[PDB]
Input
Amino acid sequence: MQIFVKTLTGKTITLEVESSDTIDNVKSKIQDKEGIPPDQQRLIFAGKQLEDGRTLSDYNIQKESTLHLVLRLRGETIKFVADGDIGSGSVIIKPFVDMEHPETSIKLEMDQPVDLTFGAKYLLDIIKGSSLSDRVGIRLSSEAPALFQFDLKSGFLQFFLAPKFN
Amino acid sequence: MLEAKFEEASLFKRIIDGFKDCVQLVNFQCKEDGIIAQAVDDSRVLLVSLEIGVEAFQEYRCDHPVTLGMDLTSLSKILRCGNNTDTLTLIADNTPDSIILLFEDTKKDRIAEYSLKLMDIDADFLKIEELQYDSTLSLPSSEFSKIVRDLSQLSDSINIMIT
Output
């Protein structure tokens, strides 16, 4: 039968599942058609994390429900600040995984700390891409324009934006 | 000889939103494996880049690459005729002067043929994405949306810090 396994890139795969399918096997029907490897996989429906050996029947997961597929990575603080004349703003976020609805989770791999500034008029244009994807990928670097990216059902929309120097 | 059919004109209407508001023109390279589009903003600080696969159209057929540079402000107008769930269809010939846009909805209900006259825009495609970036994060797009939106009230310059 037809279950949907959502990805944290906006891409939710409609896998075709049987209630007598073991968890190990979902994690495989996944790796099969989308490349993911079995030991990274973290699937999270209904507020619970899924134990390999358990059959999906073991979790009462019927047709057209949804788990959430989420990758943690073998291999702390995102901060956004604006600061001006009238005053100053600060939103601080941290990487986590949601259980009830993981599509809200914050992924982060940090290779080096980054500290960059960008024109707001540009960012204001950029966030319009919300209306194409639940989620947005963001790539920052001191050596190059930052990438912002909404994925489409097969394809994507990208915004490269150069940081300011001073 | 392009004939490309979105099952719902909403989508393409959305995608063009992305360009509107920050870029005037855009070449639209159609290929046998789909559409891709590049536009640079005026101050050359922002590049918008778009990729659309065959799997994104209801039907797609383009047995020859063709380029369609177009006025976005013009094209969006034409896209208000959209109603959002109608079947949009782009069509073009060997050497194109006009691209034809073609809406039609439930049945033979309604049908509306439009033409956008194309302009010569010089193709200077950029390939600026790096292999490695210091840092990478994903997060709900409207969360981001909210943050950018709030901090824009205080300051012309939002600055990001990861640690």
